[PDB]
Design an enzyme around this catalytic site. Sequence first.
Site, PDB file in Angstrom:
ATOM      1  CE  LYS A  46      -1.243  -1.161   3.866  1.00  0.00           C
ATOM      2  NZ  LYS A  46      -0.887  -2.364   4.738  1.00  0.00           N
ATOM      3  CG  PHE A  87      16.015  -5.348   5.364  1.00  0.00           C
ATOM      4  CD1 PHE A  87      16.755  -6.511   5.289  1.00  0.00           C
ATOM      5  CD2 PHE A  87      16.101  -4.579   6.509  1.00  0.00           C
ATOM      6  CE1 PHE A  87      17.551  -6.928   6.359  1.00  0.00           C
ATOM      7  CE2 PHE A  87      16.888  -4.975   7.587  1.00  0.00           C
ATOM      8  CZ  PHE A  87      17.623  -6.152   7.518  1.00  0.00           C
ATOM      9  CG  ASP A  92       8.431 -11.442   9.618  1.00  0.00           C
ATOM     10  OD1 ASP A  92       8.706 -11.777  10.805  1.00  0.00           O
ATOM     11  OD2 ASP A  92       7.263 -11.438   9.165  1.00  0.00           O
ATOM     12  CG  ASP A  96       7.164 -14.814  11.005  1.00  0.00           C
ATOM     13  OD1 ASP A  96       7.921 -15.102  11.963  1.00  0.00           O
ATOM     14  OD2 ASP A  96       6.594 -13.715  10.938  1.00  0.00           O
ATOM     15  NE  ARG A 101       5.186 -10.188   3.468  1.00  0.00           N
ATOM     16  CZ  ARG A 101       4.904  -9.950   4.742  1.00  0.00           C
ATOM     17  NH1 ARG A 101       3.989  -9.033   5.056  1.00  0.00           N
ATOM     18  NH2 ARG A 101       5.531 -10.619   5.698  1.00  0.00           N
ATOM     19  CG  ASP A 163       7.555 -11.880  16.619  1.00  0.00           C
ATOM     20  OD1 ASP A 163       7.797 -12.908  15.926  1.00  0.00           O
ATOM     21  OD2 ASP A 163       6.443 -11.304  16.624  1.00  0.00           O
ATOM     22  CE  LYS A 189       5.346  -7.768  15.744  1.00  0.00           C
ATOM     23  NZ  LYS A 189       4.917  -9.165  15.426  1.00  0.00           N
ATOM     24  CG  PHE A 228      -0.160  -0.663  11.608  1.00  0.00           C
ATOM     25  CD1 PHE A 228      -0.890  -0.301  10.484  1.00  0.00           C
ATOM     26  CD2 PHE A 228       0.922  -1.526  11.449  1.00  0.00           C
ATOM     27  CE1 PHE A 228      -0.564  -0.782   9.230  1.00  0.00           C
ATOM     28  CE2 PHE A 228       1.266  -2.020  10.188  1.00  0.00           C
ATOM     29  CZ  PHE A 228       0.515  -1.650   9.076  1.00  0.00           C
ATOM     30  CG  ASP A 232       0.003  -7.555  10.859  1.00  0.00           C
ATOM     31  OD1 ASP A 232      -0.167  -7.558   9.618  1.00  0.00           O
ATOM     32  OD2 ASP A 232       0.760  -8.362  11.452  1.00  0.00           O
ATOM     33  CG  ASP A 233      -1.004  -9.284  16.106  1.00  0.00           C
ATOM     34  OD1 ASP A 233      -0.182  -9.431  15.183  1.00  0.00           O
ATOM     35  OD2 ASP A 233      -0.679  -9.003  17.275  1.00  0.00           O
TER      36      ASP A 233
END
Length: 338
Positions: A46, A87, A92, A96, A101, A163, A189, A228, A232-233
């Site tokens: 975005k 990056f 990540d 993860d 993505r 995390d 983070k 924010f 996301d979670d």
Amino acid sequence: DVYAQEKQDFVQHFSQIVRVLTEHPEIGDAIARLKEVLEYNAIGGKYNRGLTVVVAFRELVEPRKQDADSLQRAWTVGWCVELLQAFFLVADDIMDSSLTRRGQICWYQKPGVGLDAINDANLLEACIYRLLKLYCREQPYYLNLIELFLQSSYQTEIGQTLDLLTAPQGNVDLVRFTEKRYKSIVKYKTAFYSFYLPIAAAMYMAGIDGEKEHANAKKILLEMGEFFQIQDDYLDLFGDPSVTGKIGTDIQDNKCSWLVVQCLQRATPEQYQILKENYGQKEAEKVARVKALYEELDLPAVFLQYEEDSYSHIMALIEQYAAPLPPAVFLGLARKIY
Ligand SMILES: CCCCCCOc1ccnc(NC(P(=O)(O)O)P(=O)(O)O)c1
Ligand SMILES: [Mg+2]
Ligand SMILES: [Mg+2]
Ligand SMILES: [Mg+2]
């Protein structure tokens, strides 16, 4: 909406960023890999973080000082923020075990990339400083910007460490999943680099380097970043996967999600056991049982109430700490996340 208009002019400027970065014929093949990394990984989002640099810049600088060069520096540094994001994301997604993505398969899942993506990701980081030197080294804010990007890396990487240490693979984790640990994780983070960094960069570019002002700004922006990440979670599990462009992993990955933190606060003993036996495992059957427990605890409604209370809170904070910066600087951003 200021963000909505600037989007295309900002995206349009990406070709120049790549042009200046991808230009010693011996390292020719390497620069062609770099361009390929940039095209795949810096495009498709975005652009809220980089746009914030451009929007805050226009709003802080006097029109009589917004010449071509001055504006070019602004959206170059916006693109530096985008590069920092790319990056972080490339690395990540490896850590993860993510699948997609921004609506396409993760860079490290592409046949022929794999763990080479580790170097690809760090190249994106290198490009930030390549760009700062190419466009900002003679500005009085050169060092401020370098130090602000560097500290942001440190910040997010410290947050990422929290995390990962809170989500050890293969370990029933529930005791660690507390509000106080959650707030720490996301402050470092996510909130610092997604919200403080772009406003701060614009502030420095505008000659606003007063400590008190940056602290007041920061106060607003870290709380925005906290919401924010909570959003996301929420989206990891409950978002429309065709909108978010990515598949959730938080439950499988044993993450200290806002959702699980809220679950543990509402869970009966019998429901806590359901969680303990199904969280943090790869089995689809067990993940689905977590989702059913969340929906049975009305977490989607609890998120909804939280988003409105948080909105009012950020609004209160803007009224407290915006001055002397124009309120629009934060209302533009806040409007884009709520
Ligand atoms: C050396 C670089 C280490 C990797 C740093 C990654 O940093 C961040 C920071 C904030 N958000 C993300 N990704 C988020 P997502 O994968 O886009 O949902 P997550 O935290 O939920 O995984 C990732
Ligand atoms: Mg992560
Ligand atoms: Mg992730
Ligand atoms: Mg996430």
